[PDB]
């Protein structure tokens, strides 16, 4: 059987919290007034919810309303409990209210509004300094939620709302987030394909906060190298092959051998043999203004096969890449 694993930091935070902190199945939702919120325009639709811009008519301020599609009550309670636990934290989206939508017959979560620019266009304009600044801001949110016993499990550009005018960032969409408990086996069907960590792609269930650090490394690689997404797999099997063409197959085998994991035999025909690459091969004249020795070393320390070898969020914030970022 597989070798067990523990987070190297914040391992026992939920153990010593009161049970009501992490026992979301017992959470009692405090419902607000559904008539406080007038929907203005639909912003998007996903498989789990629809998202609207709305106005809170008690203060005439914009809010964002996520009306959930039918899903399990425990998953709705999990997201609500996590949002309430994290509320007030650095760069965490604020849950302002929870109401019962009379049409959908489901809960509607009401969030603070961020005047965001879509990442496709925003990422074309970010400078080297901007990328370091916003990476540091994401790390504040990730160290906070990890320190609070929670892994986000869906870090990707679409879930980082940036108001570039005010240099404001919020980490959003906590619907896949979970409480970390030592020894717990988790569902590997989390995160978006391009941001899935190797642990998910080899079906290793006893993972932890370090998953979010792989996803963040994938974001960083796409930004400094101007290739979005960086690891561009056509399915979950090809995703691991794309990773192995950069990190190499020998260290992939070291990873699965450490945890006494077997690869899916369907990789026998597609994985090949690949040396580990040096990050300098991805630098060219059109991205070199975003690349520095510090950026490559930082990236190299996030993108490790072994989840136990990745920088923690706090360690990442100590990295020389962030020395040029102004801290007040
Ligand atoms: C414009 O500013 C904001 C935008 C979004 C949020 C909060 C969201 S959106 C979300 N899930 C999504 C995402 C896309 C489509 C679908 Cl259907 C669901 N999960 C959150 O927490 C908050 C803001 O202030």
Curated annotation (Swiss-Prot):
Phosphorylation does not directly affect casein kinase 2 activity, but may contribute to its regulation by forming binding sites for interacting proteins and/or targeting it to different compartments. Constitutively active protein kinase whose activity is not directly affected by phosphorylation. Seems to be regulated by level of expression and localization. The keyword Calcium does not apply. It comes from the Eukaryota. Belongs to the protein kinase superfamily. Ser/Thr protein kinase family. CK2 subfamily. Heterotetramer composed of two catalytic subunits (alpha chain and/or alpha' chain) and two regulatory subunits (beta chains). The tetramer can exist as a combination of 2 alpha/2 beta, 2 alpha'/2 beta or 1 alpha/1 alpha'/2 beta subunits. Also part of a CK2-SPT16-SSRP1 complex composed of SSRP1, SUPT16H, CSNK2A1, CSNK2A2 and CSNK2B, which forms following UV irradiation. Interacts with RNPS1. Interacts with SNAI1. Interacts with PML (isoform PML-12). Interacts with CCAR2. Interacts with HIRIP3. This is Casein kinase II subunit alpha. The gene is CSNK2A1. The chain holds residues 3 to 330 of 391 of the full protein.
């Amino acid at each position: 059987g597989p070798v067990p694993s523990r987070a190297r930091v914040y391992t026992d935070v939920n153990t010593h919290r009161p049970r009501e902190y992490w026992d979301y199945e017992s959470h009692v939702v405090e419902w607000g007034n559904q008539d406080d919120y007038q929907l203005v325009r639909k912003l998007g639709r996903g498989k789990y919810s629809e998202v609207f811009e709305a106005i809170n008519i008690t203060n005439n301020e914009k809010v964002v309303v996520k009306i959930l599609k039918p899903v399990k009550k425990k998953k709705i309670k999990r997201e609500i409990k996590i949002l309430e636990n994290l509320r007030g934290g650095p760069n965490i989206i604020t849950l302002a209210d929870i109401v019962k939508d009379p049409v959908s017959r489901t809960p509607a979560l009401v969030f603070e509004h961020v005047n965001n620019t879509d990442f496709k266009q925003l990422y074309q304009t970010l400078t080297d300094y901007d990328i370091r600044f916003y990476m540091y801001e994401i790390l504040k949110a990730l160290d906070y939620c990890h320190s609070m016993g929670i892994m986000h499990r869906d870090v990707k550009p679409h879930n980082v709302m940036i108001d570039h005018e005010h240099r404001k960032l919020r980490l959003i969409d906590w619907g896949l987030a979970e409480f970390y408990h030592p020894g717990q086996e988790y569902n590997v069907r989390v995160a978006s394909r391009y941001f899935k960590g190797p642990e998910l792609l080899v079906d290793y269930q006893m993972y932890d906060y370090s998953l979010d650090m792989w996803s963040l490394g994938c974001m960083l690689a796409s930004m400094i190298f101007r290739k979005e997404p960086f690891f561009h797999g056509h399915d979950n099997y090809d995703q691991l092959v794309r990773i192995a063409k950069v990190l190499g197959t020998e260290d992939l085998y070291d990873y699965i051998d450490k945890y006494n994991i077997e690869l899916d035999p369907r990789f026998n025909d597609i994985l090949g043999r690949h040396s580990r690459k040096r990050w300098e091969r991805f630098v060219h004249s059109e991205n070199q203004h975003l690349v520095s020795p510090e950026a490559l070393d930082f990236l190299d320390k996030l993108l490790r096969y072994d989840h136990q070898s990745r920088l923690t969020a706090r360690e990442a914030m100590e990295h020389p890449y962030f020395y040029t970022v102004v801290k007040d």
